[PDB]
Each structure stands twice: as structure tokens, then as C-alpha cells.
Write a protein that binds this DNA or RNA. Structure first.
Lengths: 267, 46
RNA sequence: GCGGAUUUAGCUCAGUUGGGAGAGCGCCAGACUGAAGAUCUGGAGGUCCUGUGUUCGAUCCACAGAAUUCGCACC
RNA sequence: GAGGGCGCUUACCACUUUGUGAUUCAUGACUGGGGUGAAGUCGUAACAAGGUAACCGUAGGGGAACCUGCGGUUGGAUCA
RNA sequence: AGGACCGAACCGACUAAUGUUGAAAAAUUAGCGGAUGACUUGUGGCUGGGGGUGAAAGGCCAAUCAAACCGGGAGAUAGCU
RNA sequence: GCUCGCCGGAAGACCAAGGGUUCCUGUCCAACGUUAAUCGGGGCAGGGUGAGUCGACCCCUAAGGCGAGGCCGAAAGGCGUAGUCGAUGGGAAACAGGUUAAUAUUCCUGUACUUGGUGUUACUGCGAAGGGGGGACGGAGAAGGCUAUGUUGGCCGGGCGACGGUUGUCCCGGUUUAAGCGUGUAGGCUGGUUUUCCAGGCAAAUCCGGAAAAUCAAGGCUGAGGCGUGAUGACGAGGCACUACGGUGCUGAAGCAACAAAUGCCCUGCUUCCAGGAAAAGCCUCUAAGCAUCAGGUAACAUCAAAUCGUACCCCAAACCGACACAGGUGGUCAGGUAGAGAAUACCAAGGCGCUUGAGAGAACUCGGGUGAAGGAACUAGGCAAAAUGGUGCCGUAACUUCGGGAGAAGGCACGCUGAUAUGUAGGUGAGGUCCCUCGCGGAUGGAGCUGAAAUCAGUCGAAGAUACCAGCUGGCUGCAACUGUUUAUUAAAAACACAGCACUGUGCAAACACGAAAGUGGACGUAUACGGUGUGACGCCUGCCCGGUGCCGGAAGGUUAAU
RNA sequence: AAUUCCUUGUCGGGUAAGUUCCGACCUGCACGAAUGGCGUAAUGAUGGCCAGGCUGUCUCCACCCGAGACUCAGUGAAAUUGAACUCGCUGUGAAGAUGCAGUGUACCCGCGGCAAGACGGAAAGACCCCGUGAACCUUUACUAUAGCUUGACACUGAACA
RNA sequence: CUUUAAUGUUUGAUGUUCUAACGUUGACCCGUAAUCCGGGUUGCGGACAGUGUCUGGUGGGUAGUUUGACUGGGGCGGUC
């Protein structure tokens, strides 16, 4: 958060330094194309996801796939997403259609947003990687070939193309540089939108986490009726694991469909 | 705390309901032992 | 009280079939140093608790006593 | 009729304190800094290669006696 | 702007004071805040037994539940006067 | 009568928890009112609560019931598409007068309207199961007007008003203007009108999204209400009788403008901040088929249908509940009043109505306190109790930097009632009179009628004036949870600790978890910077160090010796 | 600090008196790196005595409007039970004299004082064991079922190297 | 007749892969103004999955029990 435009916190004349002082990206109304998520954990019956607090979920931005590549478009405005920290834009497709696309740091003018098979190369709707050049930035990447993108945010997550890797089977990311997903999956570009919303804490608490969920706060500590410890007296002080399932290192997988992970350096 | 006895209609559908006292077999023996064999009445149908 | 340990070389304690009394180390000489230590080869250093018994031979065990010492017995 | 004597009005203003701080004395109740080096002891890297150096800002192991690894300007022996 | 400092009935729960031989398994009088939300607030259908939601309590949960308001096992075991 | 009370966030209003018809009166005492007992919904004889518009069918649904065929299933039963239920989401949709004990959007009495058949004239190309406008929100607000309603007097009814005073400058009483039509104003939204074409919109498309020209700028959709229309429509001071003494019978004044604020109207205006305020519809139009000299719809006015209830007592709360008209709870609802920071408090007019145990007596029997000579906590587990101190402003105040804050620190103080500037200052207000203009809900000049600080010079009455109800110990110390706290209602009232960052950890992904027997519903409309482990202990530094044992697991050089 | 192993350790300054208003030579068992440590923001649902207030907090409350309760009228129910005409240290011990008599000799009644006097009441005493014993929570004892976990035969084939 | 080779003729296994199993919780096509859901071109990994017991500790995540007696009442120290 050395970056710009940064919005740095306040001089201490109120209890709050954070939250994020980003003028110029909330907006109203919730435009015509919108939806919501509903009830509480409600799994049928005795829910395993602890603490809940499930009021105000509430609404989400509706556009998944975004597979309209070839038809050119332009940038109307950009917003924010309280479900992902995501920098999303509202995009008018010159054919006659309005849509919501995931964006980098300030992509406006309203620029030249287009894709198409070898025909184009710009920051472009969704776009196949075996038809464009090699960099750090890629973004959308169908989590497998036609299913849907992997990353619904521009939170910072660089996936990194390799050129000709074992015949198109590419990328280089964080926890498994042997994804071997073929370059027949779709890009868009690129991974830093608002790092400012995530790289720094918004509050201790904040609206982000107490108006419609409760996070986690305990497991081990108090009332021995749930976890493997213990007697009383404030004491704790034993061996008490996360049983029957584990904690501090072991792994969990052995067999799956696709299963592509191979070498695994871990640590 | 807000103790206790009160009358109402809409709360009868999971507990106090005459068609459910025939729908459930658990109610159905009671219903006959209380009037059809039990020499009696209920009539409180309102 | 009972049951254990301990009284084996200046230091630290190893060791006992139950027949020899030990080395890490300190001294002594030997020479290398004017000297001394290191390091060095040689040599030495003993209340092996006392008493009685078993025994071929008791430092050792068994038994009686003495004494340091510890855990528990006490509330 | 007029003041000044008074008798009201009120202040400059002595006492007085809401306060708490300058700085000067001994009563200096866990100490550690810079040395003489009346025999100090453990150690001993540097003033020639102080007999398989390392000076300089110094960051670090932590008996430092600061080892030790760059960058020089030869106040460090040559035919390395 | 800020779960601001200091504000009403919509909040609970500090010691007392006339609460114990009850107005009462809980609430009180001159007093007193958290001041817009780590608020509580109400029609009803999803938590129906050894429970099931966790500001995480052995307190709850009919008011006294470490399994009770069930009566069908069962007029049980019975070292029991 | 006569003097005063309780509820004062009223037991004012209409009615929703269904308990149900036990209100008025005509008359009454067990089956009851821990007193009388006339009253208490007691309890008895009558009767009753008039709804096309109130709200719920409807067309309608977010959550959630059920559900074809089914994946399944011991017998049970589980989960679900199309459908179909479905409000506490939405849409059209009662007012001034009068009249019965009541009970009243009803009743009457007129105004005149909403859904759908029908008729006589008139106009016109219509349509859907599909398209698009939005149909739709959340509260703090900001800004202008309307004045609700009050006080005043011109003006009108009464008269000079029982003590002392009062006969034109007093002192009382009404102070109403209904409709729907008519038009448009306050802020606001939007430059007007045609023509030609697409990489678009479930097949289409006069409607929507994007494009490409033409011709013009003054164009379009209302809105509280002022204002007015109605209305020789009435209400009513009073006048004259009659009575079943309730009233109704006959008749009747007056009838203007100012001044100041809403709890409400405009404002799904317009602003400001983000947890991110839910769908079928009315509102407004596009076509598909198929009609197609046919049919449909919109309009003047003529009519009929207006689809079983409920409407009675009753509430910020005695026929609910508590169960003794119970010091539990606890409402959407008209907001009654002046000075008030206030739903902070002794005072109110009313509506029910003063609430069916009170006479005398005046030992000690602490449900208590006050002013004490002395002294000032010399008491003690509890300066406990009784407080007191509680404004703007100032004659001016200390440690401490997180330079906010520690600062209504602290200290003590003029305070009543009024001359004079000022037959009220200033400031707020804008009648008329006079002029202009675009023609009309228009502006310029101007000072009528209300109102009301804040001080300066001067007074002097105190034992007392913020003469009264609201409402505070400077401290200064110990251990810094560092965010207010209300979070373990049940010993503690926090001296509990819920923050929240992160190295590491479980998932390269049909992800971790499986609750339900078949779910893939949390997480997901989502990627290892998403969500979870175990925690973290403001902030900011700082985590030195040291691997014996013992964990955490990983592995294979290699033996203990297995289902294979 | 809940180590103060040793004892209320101190030097003694301040002080009607320092078992401390602290006013820096320690006597350190069983101190700390996330069960953490050098520290602190303004807030008190504020824990513990310490100034000056105001004083009746001691010892000293003897006066009071006064609730009422004994009194006078309506009404009078049980938290359930030892006959009473129940001697005020009494003595003697199935180790307790309102009843084994040495004494004093208390008229009948206020249920008005009602101060020790059903050891009493609110009730299977909490200290609690004979318990062939309700289950009631744990831990590098004991484990077990559900599970965690991989390798294994069942099952799903050999063509080549 | 073998320590052993080349081949025939009898035959087991592990690597090495392709792949009508299979799973489609991936698309396109498709019954269909369709969230369940029918079925194929295709795409994907792949004999993987699924669990039935056998071997293994791993934890106090159901349930269970309180296993003598000796008591100048208990815990230790002694005995039938």
C-alpha cells in the first residue's frame, strides 16, 4: 500500500483510523441485474459450520462465465464487492448489452475492451492463452476448461504463464506449480485491482464482519463439552489435538478425479 | 417467563389439531377412547 | 521406627566372582624449558567404618554396633 | 451658598493559595561507568608474517582479546 | 465523522434499602446508563430425547432439568429400619 | 350544590390476540363484592353492533409447505422440477352534514367510481404464454412553503360587570367553508422533432440498447397548497312555546384578517454514507400466431351484478395472563397545554370517575432524620446513611504528547425587581401607498401590523435572589483488558476476555467439513492474499536462544517380522 | 508476584505512632519470549483507604407528623403436630433435670414485654460411610465403538520392455 | 543330468501405458420460454473410484464401571 491512489488513514480525533478512506467507488441504486443469498446455514439439520450469526448475507453481482469475447465493449464506471474485496466494472458491449467485468487497478477511458481467437490481445472479456503472449498477469483462468473462472477477484493472485510447457500444459502459482491445466483455458488480465482493500486491516471490528455474520473467535477455549480439553482451574497445559482429523502438518488427499499435483515441494 | 395458559387458533397445527389427531395414529386411539368408545363429546371445534 | 545409600588415593567417585586394589586429575622424577605448566613416559598416592561369622581367600556378603544421609511413618 | 470632616460607591493593593513546577542541600535502602595497575588470578590478539596478521564506519557471535567477510588509499617481507 | 462524551419508555441485571411468615422461583422508591446500533423488539411455520443454537453455558431449556411435565418396560433391584 | 382529587406516555380513540355478545337501561342479591352494598363485565328482562368501498379471496411470493415422472426404498419414510398453496409484500378503493340507548367509512343525504356483463350513438387495425422501461425499498437528513392549532383584536351576541373598583378603551362568546373540479406554483427530471440503420433483446418487434443523418433551440410528464368554484348549502348569539324533562316543536345572530411552531402534508423530490435495501403485478407499450367487408379497445352517457365474513363489549392492557379488582409483562393507533435542553419533574380540561377496611387512641417494639453546644470521621466488613457540589461566562488552571485528549480541569460569582439610552435599543418581519412588466400563482419601490436579544449608566432590598421541582468530589494512587461494553441471567459483576494482525497449516481443487438412509444445501455463484486451524492479546517493537528428553510429523539408506 | 524457603529482614528518614503517607546497600527455593514481554488512550455498569469538605459515625440520642402492632368494629385460612395441671444454676448419670427432691414456695388471666428455654422451624443435615452401588465432567493411567489413516485380497484386462 | 545359454513348448509378475469399463458435480447439442431431470456428440481424467474386514496406534470427540477388607474414620506403612 506504498501505491497510488492510496487513501492513507486519519489523524487520531476519533476511535477509528481505519476503515478504508476510498472516496469515488460506492454507488446507488442496485441496478436492474442483481441477486441475493438466503436463510442461515440450514444444511438439513445439525450444521457443522460453527458460530453462524446469519442475518444480512445479502446481495451479489450476477455475471459469471462472461464468455462474450469477440464483440467489442467500453467502461461505464467501477464499483466494489463486500463478498470478495473485488474491483468490478460496468461494461457496455457496443452490440446493445450491459454486463459486469472483473478489473485491474484503474482500467478506464472507456478504453478498447475486446477479445477473439488470435484476432485480439488487449485486457479482454475472457481470452484463450494459446493465442496470446507470456507474462505474470492472466487473471480469469477457467478452473478447468469450460467450468468457469478461478479468480473472481483482482486481490493480487498472479498465476504466471510458462511458454511451451510439456506441450501447452502451463502456469506457475503459489501452492502447486504442476497444475498442468492446458492453455486452452481462458485468460482476461490482470491481478491487481484494489490490493488496498485486503493488504491492510479495515477494522477491529468493522461492517465487513458483524452486521450479518459472526467469524469464529473460539474452539479449544471454554466449556469442555465440544473439544478434547479439559478438567477446569483455568489450567489447560496438556496435549490436546483437533481430533479425529488433525492440525499442524500431515496432508489429507490420496485419490481424486483429475488429481494434477505431481512433484509437491510444500515448504 | 411469560407464563402461560392462553387461547389462540393458529398454534394448533403442530400440537392441538383435530384432523392431525386423526392423521397421526398416535392421536387416533386417543380420539376413539375419548368419544366414539368413551361414551362422550368434545365439540370445541371453533 | 523400617528400608535404602555411604565411611575406596588432594579432587570426582569408578570397582567388587569373595585371591590383583583402580583411572579422568594433582604431586614426584625423567627431560624439552634458566624455570614451571601444557604435552610427554616412568613412578607413586589407601583408616577400602569397626567388630563377628560364612569362606580356600571378606574391600565387598550375612549378622551386631557406631556414624553421616534420604524417602515414607506424625496431621 | 461650598467643602472638608464622613459615608456611601469601588479599585491600585498587604495579608491569603487553586496550585504546583525552576533549582540548592544530605537521609543517597536492585547498582555499574572512565582508572591507579604492593606482588592479584582465568585468558593474551594486535605495535616484523607479535612466528595458518588484519587497522576503517561497523552490523554480529557472545570468556572478545570482537573474531571475520567485502572496498581501498601499501603507515604489513619478496622474484610469491 | 465515531460500537461520539452527556440524551426516553424498545436494555438488563452490582449492593442494598421496606425483597424471605412471598405482590414474589422473582420484582422493587425518591436513584441511574449502553444514546442508534458488538442494540432488543413482538403473529408463525425448520432444530421433537438422551437433545442442539454456541459471545461458548454446566446456567439454560416451565419456572427446582447432569434429562425433566411421559406413562406404556415394571406393583424394577431389593444386603432397606 | 360546595371546596378539592387519581390515571397526566389517561383505565381519551378503533379494533386485530377469540375469548366471544355479561356494554346503555328496565331492575337485583346468590351462584357473589374478606366493609356498607345503591355499585362490581357480577345478572338478570329487552334487544342488539346496519360495510359494493374497512380489511384477507383475487391476478400475486422471499422464506417455507407439498408435488407428476423419479434416485431410492426392510415395512416406515427422505429429498425435489413443472405446478400450486402463499402477506406480516403489493394494486384500485370515504368525506362534510345528520341519528338511533346503542353500534356507526355503513344508517341516511349527496358527491359522484371501481371491477365486470349489457345498450344507443361515435372513433380507431387488434393482439401473448415471449421483449423493454422500472414495478423497488434501507434511515440519518438538508432546504422551502402549507399552516394544524392557538392567541389577538377590526366585527358581531351580552352589558358595564354581587365585596373594593369599575358606564370608549373593558371582557367575555362563536371566529366554520366540506366535496372534485380546476392546473401547476415551491424544488425537481429532461434541450425539442423527424429520417436512415445494426456484430444486440428466448422466433419476432413502431418498444429497449447502440449508431448514423436531417430539421428545429423556448419543447415534455405534476406537485403541498395558496387561490377559487359550491353556497338564497347552512350552522348558529338569541326570540316564542310545548314536554314523555331525553328533548323537539316554531324561528334566528354574526360570519375579518394577522402572528408563530408540528408529532403531519410536499420530498419513490434532493443530498449524504455503505452492511450492499427480495419476486409475480397495476403504470407505460412492443410484437408471435391468428383474425383479417370479421373481430378487438376507448369514449359520451344509459344500467345491472356488486359472491358465505366480520363489525358487540376490551388494551403502551381485571372476563388474556398473572390465576387473592395482584409492586410479571407490554402494543401498531389522533398526539391535549404555556414558560422546559426533556416521554427530565410537584401543577392540568376531559374519559373512566376519587378506585366498598377506618374510627378513634398517641408507652418502649426503628420501613427514620435534623438542625445539634463540643470536636471532625477519634465509627467500623461498607464518609454506609443525610448530601453538597450540578449554568452560559469570567476577574483566568497542574503532572503528562498517543500534540485529539488529560480541559463544562480546578476556582467562587454578579444573578431578585425595574429607570434611562429605548412613549423600547439591535436583530427578525414586509402591509399598503407608489411605479414597471412578460400580461398573471410576475417583479421594483416601499415601513404598516407583530416581535424581541444583549449590555451600559444608575439604583437598593436580604438571614436569604441561577430565592422552586432537572442535573457532578480537583484529586493523586495500582496491575494498563488498550476499541463503548453487559458477555457466563444462579455466588463473582469482571480483577472474564470477543478483538485483530501471522509465520505455519487442510484444499491445485467434484475444494476442508456429511448433519439426512439418496442430497451437494454452508463455504458458492466461489481458489491455496477466497474459507477453516489451535490461539493471538491496543500500538509499536521484540521474540534473544539452547535439541537432552518428549512431541509434530516426514522418509527409506535398513533390521525387528504381517493380512499378502 | 499467590517464590517473599530463611523472621512482620532492611538504613532509618518523615510521622501525636510508619506490621507504611514509601523514603531504592536487597537475604532472589518452585522469574519470562505468544500460558510473552519494557510500557500506555481518553471512558469507570469503580476495586482499596487517604486529605479537606459538610457532619452527630464512636461514646451522648433524652423532643417530635408520624406507618402501625397489642386496642375498637367486617373477616381469620396453614409452612402440622409431645398428654401440661410444662420448677428459676439445681443434684444423679442407658455421661444434659420445665417430671430419679437437697432446698425457696411462683393465686386466676393479659399471648402485652416476649430476653436462654418444642434445640426449633424454610428441608431426605453440607461434613457422608456398611453402599455387590443413578451416572457425573477427564489424562503421554485403562480403553472402546463411531472414526483417522495408508499398504491388501476381494474386484476392473495384457500387450510390450 | 546340472551350475546355465540360444529357442521352442508350458506359464506367473512389475514396470510401460491405450482405453467401448467408469465418473461425468465439464462443455456443446438437446426434450424445454425448465433450478429437477431424459438422452447423444464431445471433452476429461482413468481400472483410479467403492467400501467388506484382517494388521497398525491415535485420542479422552458415546458409553461404561467405581471391584474387597483390616478403619482407637480414612490417603500412605502392615497383613487371608
Amino acid at each position: 500500500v506504498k501505491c497510488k491512489p492510496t487513501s492513507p488513514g486519519r489523524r487520531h480525533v476519533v476511535k477509528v483510523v481505519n476503515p478504508e478512506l476510498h472516496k469515488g467507488k460506492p454507488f446507488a441504486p442496485l441496478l436492474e441485474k442483481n441477486s441475493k443469498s438466503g436463510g442461515r446455514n440450514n444444511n438439513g439439520r445439525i450444521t457443522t459450520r460453527h458460530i453462524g450469526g446469519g442475518h444480512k448475507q445479502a446481495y451479489r453481482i450476477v455475471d459469471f462465465k462472461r464468455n462474450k469475447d469477440g464483440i467489442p465493449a467500453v467502461v461505464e464506471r467501477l464499483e466494489y464487492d463486500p463478498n470478495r474485496s473485488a474491483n468490478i466494472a460496468l461494461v457496455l458491449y457496443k452490440d446493445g448489452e450491459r454486463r459486469y467485468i472483473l478489473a485491474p487497478k484503474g482500467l478506464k477511458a472507456g478504453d478498447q475492451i475486446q477479445s477473439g481467437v488470435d484476432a485480439a490481445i488487449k485486457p479482454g472479456n475472457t481470452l484463450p492463452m494459446r493465442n496470446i503472449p507470456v507474462g505474470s498477469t492472466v487473471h480469469n483462468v477457467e478452473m478447468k476448461p469450460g467450468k468457469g473462472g478461478q479468480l473472481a477477484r483482482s486481490a493480487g493472485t498472479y498465476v504466471q504463464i510458462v511458454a511451451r510447457d510439456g506441450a501447452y500444459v502451463t502456469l506457475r502459482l503459489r501452492s502447486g506449480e504442476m497444475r498442468k491445466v492446458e492453455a486452452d483455458c481462458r485468460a482476461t488480465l490482470g491481478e491487481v485491482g484494489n490490493a488496498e482493500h485486503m493488504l491492510r486491516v479495515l477494522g477491529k471490528a468493522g461492517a465487513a464482519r458483524w452486521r450479518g455474520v459472526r467469524p469464529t473467535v473460539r474452539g479449544t477455549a471454554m466449556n469442555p463439552v465440544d473439544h478434547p480439553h479439559g478438567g477446569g482451574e483455568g489450567r489447560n497445559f496438556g496435549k490436546h489435538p483437533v481430533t479425529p482429523w488433525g492440525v499442524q502438518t500431515k496432508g489429507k488427499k490420496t485419490r481424486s478425479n483429475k488429481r494434477t499435483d505431481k512433484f509437491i515441494v510444500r515448504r | 417467563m411469560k407464563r402461560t395458559f392462553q387461547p389462540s387458533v393458529l398454534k394448533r397445527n403442530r400440537s392441538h389439531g383435530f384432523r392431525a389427531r386423526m392423521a397421526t395414529k398416535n392421536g387416533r386411539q386417543v380420539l376413539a377412547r375419548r368419544r366414539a368408545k368413551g361414551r362422550a363429546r368434545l365439540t370445541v371445534s371453533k
